[PDB]
Amino acid sequence: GPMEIIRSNFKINLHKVYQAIEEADFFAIDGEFSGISDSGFDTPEERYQKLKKHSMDFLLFQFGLCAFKYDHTDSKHVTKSFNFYVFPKPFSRSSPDVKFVCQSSSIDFLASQGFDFNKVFCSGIPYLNQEEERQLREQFDEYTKEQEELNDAVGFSRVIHAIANSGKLVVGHNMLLDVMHTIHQFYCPLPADLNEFKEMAICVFPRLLDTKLMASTQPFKDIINNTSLAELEKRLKETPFDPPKVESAEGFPSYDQLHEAGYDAYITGLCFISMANYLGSSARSKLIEPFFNKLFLMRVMDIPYLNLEGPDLQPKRDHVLHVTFPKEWKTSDLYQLFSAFGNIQISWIDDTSAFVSLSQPEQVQIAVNTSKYAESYRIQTYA
Amino acid sequence: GPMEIIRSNFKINLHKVYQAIEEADFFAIDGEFSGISDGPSVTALTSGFDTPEERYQKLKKHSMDFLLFQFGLCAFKYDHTDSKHVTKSFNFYVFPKPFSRSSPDVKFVCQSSSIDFLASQGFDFNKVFCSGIPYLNQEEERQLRETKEQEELNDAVGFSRVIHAIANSGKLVVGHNMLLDVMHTIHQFYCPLPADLNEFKEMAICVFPRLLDTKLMASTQPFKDIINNTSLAELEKRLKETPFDPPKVESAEHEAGYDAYITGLCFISMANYLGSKLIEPFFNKLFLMRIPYLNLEGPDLQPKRDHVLHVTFPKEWKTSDLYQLFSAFGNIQISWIDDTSAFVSLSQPEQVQIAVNTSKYAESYRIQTYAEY
Ligand SMILES: Nc1nc2c(ncn2[C@@H]2O[C@H](COP(=O)(O)OP(=O)(O)O)[C@@H](O)[C@H]2O)c(=O)[nH]1
Ligand SMILES: Nc1nc2c(ncn2[C@@H]2O[C@H](COP(=O)(O)OP(=O)(O)O)[C@@H](O)[C@H]2O)c(=O)[nH]1
């Protein structure tokens, strides 16, 4: 796989990690979580707040990290990936005792994937957020010993520190949750306001790029019809793309199967490269700039992306409509359908539903009039 | 030292279990859980003097989202020829794996210290989370209703089938300090715990007509004078020596199972010594950790709240500082409530007043009568 970094081998390895971050062009990351949940016309604000009130009690317990460095001689990319198992084992008797939530399906899913929970609960690496640390960098304040038990307590947060400070590009795939959890668990409680969080986000990560958003915009919008990470990996292997040669750095395990955070980062990163290369027809480039710190959005009316530099474009509601259809529909069906009106923007809501936005107010009205003669589906305007 | 009953081997084993339940004199049970408390502290949850209704309510509000994920069951049958007890013990790993895409997706909570503790005991979490046995409560079962499906119904109820078996056999179920095991058990496999204690007491004795808590037994005459520590592991040691003797026990052919196996053995040692009807008085009184017990099958009691006062003091003090402060009133009984407070039980009701007056003149500590909010 990648490196299996657990509690018992965190310290001896840490430097290998720092080096990889420090020598990398960008890295791609991914999180595995304890669970997803204990929509539609939410303002980003309302989205944020729902995910805050309903997703953040879950534990990010496996963190994937894949560093990519471009070698200019062999025209290839060298990689290094890692699997960090993280677990808030209490430090002391007075140290806070974390209570996280588990979602049965998510657990059962990870079960179906060969995940090893023992590595998380028996061998997970500890960590501390901003407060827990500094509060304790005062307690432990006014021979050499405990100063080095401080570096043990913050434990995994050190690797986050490293990413945050490298000022290099961090790529994820549909990563709004990965980002949310990561600051929640390793920096501090998510703030009351979305504005407040966008600030907070870009100090941990200065440069974010969501592959799923990339795959869902021109020119990719027209050549790709499913943006699942698994399906995206497939589509970017065939023309008019070209999959970059990726080599495992000597002494790391390569891949040659089952989902982990590491693997998925490694894949996400490859996706990013393939889509960058196509765009030039580089990995720090100006071509990719417009994608920086715009996070992907799910199940939403007219927001194309979450802006992290803020604030977000208005919906322009009089452009949208809600459709319900046989589950047997695939994206091409939705396009071909509304093809009368030209390019459209899709946003899957269900397995049997999706939001569409049309080019003009007059158009919405019309597709509704047409649908009066169909059975397969139904069109809406205001719920 | 039970059988490891997991998902993949539940169905083929089930009959062995039914039969042991079916041939047993009594069973001993024990649960391992996901966690003890969300919010409040350990002692904040076992407050020392607080009434059942208020206790039940606490534990309801603060313990029930935790997962009972390992069930220990040991059945005991007395053989009259060799004067021995025959045993059978089981370790069920249970996990609410969702049945369908429409079936409820359970959201249980974990407490890091509990998990961490279990880790230090060799617990295998993969057994729970990858190989845990599904199950459904009263509702879910009644409700997912409306060939092969008639047979996937009996797979979805899964573990609850074992609890049904115990509940119906009407035989005695012995636990050690078992109020939580009980509450979870019905919470997970029967239905949401009810708004009131009395509604719970009803609920409790339908699932289990005959309950006996070993820790309460060991905490009463004649055992009260002969035993000084009633922790299960300590209790198992004390009941080995005089004036007891360890039951002749044999099998047929740290886990919740093992714990049950021990729990039951304690019971037998204490039954033997007591010499049934001699045992009856203990039935369906559950142990309180604070008055020593719950119901008597209704209602509990209302002890003399008089002779007790609560104190606030600087954090640096210690148990012996506190004995110092109350020397005037002879030997006393303490229940630490927290970092800077404790309850103090004085001998005579009056003494509390005179303690209140003696302390108008001192800054360090503070005092109120138990009566306050
Ligand atoms: N932004 C967002 N992400 C989610 C939500 N629910 C799940 N995810 C994440 O999105 C990822 C799935 O994205 P993708 O691979 O493209 O699958 P798909 O889009 O659901 O078909 C998962 O790894 C989840 O962590 C949600 O409500 N909002
Ligand atoms: N703040 C404070 N805590 C203490 C002191 N002495 C002991 N403790 C803690 O109080 C708790 C009492 O635990 P224990 O000695 O087992 O008695 P128990 O609480 O009744 O189980 C322990 O977990 C100790 O760590 C003290 O002087 N100050």
PDB file of N, CA and C and ligand atoms in Angstrom, chain A residues 93, chain B residues 42-43 315-319 336 338-340, ligand 2:
ATOM      1  N   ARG A  93      -5.079  11.951  33.196  1.00  0.00           N
ATOM      2  CA  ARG A  93      -6.340  11.741  33.881  1.00  0.00           C
ATOM      3  C   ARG A  93      -7.159  13.033  33.837  1.00  0.00           C
TER       4      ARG A  93
ATOM      5  N   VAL B  42     -17.483  10.673  35.989  1.00  0.00           N
ATOM      6  CA  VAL B  42     -17.824   9.351  36.538  1.00  0.00           C
ATOM      7  C   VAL B  42     -18.648   9.498  37.826  1.00  0.00           C
ATOM      8  N   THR B  43     -18.059  10.160  38.815  1.00  0.00           N
ATOM      9  CA  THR B  43     -18.754  10.452  40.061  1.00  0.00           C
ATOM     10  C   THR B  43     -19.969  11.397  39.873  1.00  0.00           C
ATOM     11  N   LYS B 315      -8.623  23.358  46.441  1.00  0.00           N
ATOM     12  CA  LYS B 315      -8.311  22.144  45.691  1.00  0.00           C
ATOM     13  C   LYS B 315      -7.184  21.293  46.277  1.00  0.00           C
ATOM     14  N   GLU B 316      -6.346  21.911  47.112  1.00  0.00           N
ATOM     15  CA  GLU B 316      -5.118  21.280  47.631  1.00  0.00           C
ATOM     16  C   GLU B 316      -5.378  20.243  48.725  1.00  0.00           C
ATOM     17  N   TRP B 317      -6.582  20.280  49.324  1.00  0.00           N
ATOM     18  CA  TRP B 317      -6.926  19.437  50.484  1.00  0.00           C
ATOM     19  C   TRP B 317      -6.946  17.985  50.061  1.00  0.00           C
ATOM     20  N   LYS B 318      -7.012  17.083  51.033  1.00  0.00           N
ATOM     21  CA  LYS B 318      -7.021  15.649  50.772  1.00  0.00           C
ATOM     22  C   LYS B 318      -7.896  14.955  51.797  1.00  0.00           C
ATOM     23  N   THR B 319      -8.317  13.733  51.499  1.00  0.00           N
ATOM     24  CA  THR B 319      -9.166  12.959  52.401  1.00  0.00           C
ATOM     25  C   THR B 319      -8.896  13.135  53.925  1.00  0.00           C
ATOM     26  N   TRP B 336     -16.663  11.806  47.966  1.00  0.00           N
ATOM     27  CA  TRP B 336     -16.088  12.864  47.152  1.00  0.00           C
ATOM     28  C   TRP B 336     -17.025  13.141  46.011  1.00  0.00           C
ATOM     29  N   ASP B 338     -16.222  15.847  43.876  1.00  0.00           N
ATOM     30  CA  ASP B 338     -15.419  16.511  42.855  1.00  0.00           C
ATOM     31  C   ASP B 338     -14.138  17.176  43.397  1.00  0.00           C
ATOM     32  N   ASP B 339     -13.289  17.618  42.478  1.00  0.00           N
ATOM     33  CA  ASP B 339     -12.063  18.351  42.803  1.00  0.00           C
ATOM     34  C   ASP B 339     -12.051  19.229  44.084  1.00  0.00           C
ATOM     35  N   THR B 340     -13.173  19.888  44.376  1.00  0.00           N
ATOM     36  CA  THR B 340     -13.199  20.910  45.439  1.00  0.00           C
ATOM     37  C   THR B 340     -14.419  20.774  46.344  1.00  0.00           C
TER      38      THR B 340
HETATM   39  N1  LIG C   2      -7.745  16.841  42.535  1.00  0.00           N
HETATM   40  C1  LIG C   2      -7.280  15.781  43.234  1.00  0.00           C
HETATM   41  N2  LIG C   2      -7.589  14.521  42.814  1.00  0.00           N
HETATM   42  C2  LIG C   2      -7.147  13.425  43.493  1.00  0.00           C
HETATM   43  C3  LIG C   2      -6.319  13.622  44.695  1.00  0.00           C
HETATM   44  N3  LIG C   2      -6.022  12.388  45.153  1.00  0.00           N
HETATM   45  C4  LIG C   2      -6.606  11.482  44.334  1.00  0.00           C
HETATM   46  N4  LIG C   2      -7.276  12.104  43.343  1.00  0.00           N
HETATM   47  C5  LIG C   2      -8.027  11.459  42.231  1.00  0.00           C
HETATM   48  O1  LIG C   2      -9.363  11.163  42.628  1.00  0.00           O
HETATM   49  C6  LIG C   2      -9.764   9.896  42.110  1.00  0.00           C
HETATM   50  C7  LIG C   2     -10.238   9.034  43.252  1.00  0.00           C
HETATM   51  O2  LIG C   2     -10.043   7.698  42.784  1.00  0.00           O
HETATM   52  P1  LIG C   2      -9.816   6.506  43.836  1.00  0.00           P
HETATM   53  O3  LIG C   2      -8.582   6.762  44.678  1.00  0.00           O
HETATM   54  O4  LIG C   2      -9.720   5.186  43.107  1.00  0.00           O
HETATM   55  O5  LIG C   2     -11.187   6.590  44.688  1.00  0.00           O
HETATM   56  P2  LIG C   2     -12.598   6.539  43.894  1.00  0.00           P
HETATM   57  O6  LIG C   2     -12.793   7.789  43.068  1.00  0.00           O
HETATM   58  O7  LIG C   2     -13.749   6.404  44.882  1.00  0.00           O
HETATM   59  O8  LIG C   2     -12.565   5.398  42.894  1.00  0.00           O
HETATM   60  C8  LIG C   2      -8.548   9.206  41.521  1.00  0.00           C
HETATM   61  O9  LIG C   2      -8.764   8.939  40.123  1.00  0.00           O
HETATM   62  C9  LIG C   2      -7.381  10.144  41.789  1.00  0.00           C
HETATM   63  O10 LIG C   2      -6.574  10.303  40.604  1.00  0.00           O
HETATM   64  C10 LIG C   2      -6.024  15.034  45.089  1.00  0.00           C
HETATM   65  O11 LIG C   2      -5.329  15.305  46.094  1.00  0.00           O
HETATM   66  N5  LIG C   2      -6.525  16.022  44.328  1.00  0.00           N
END
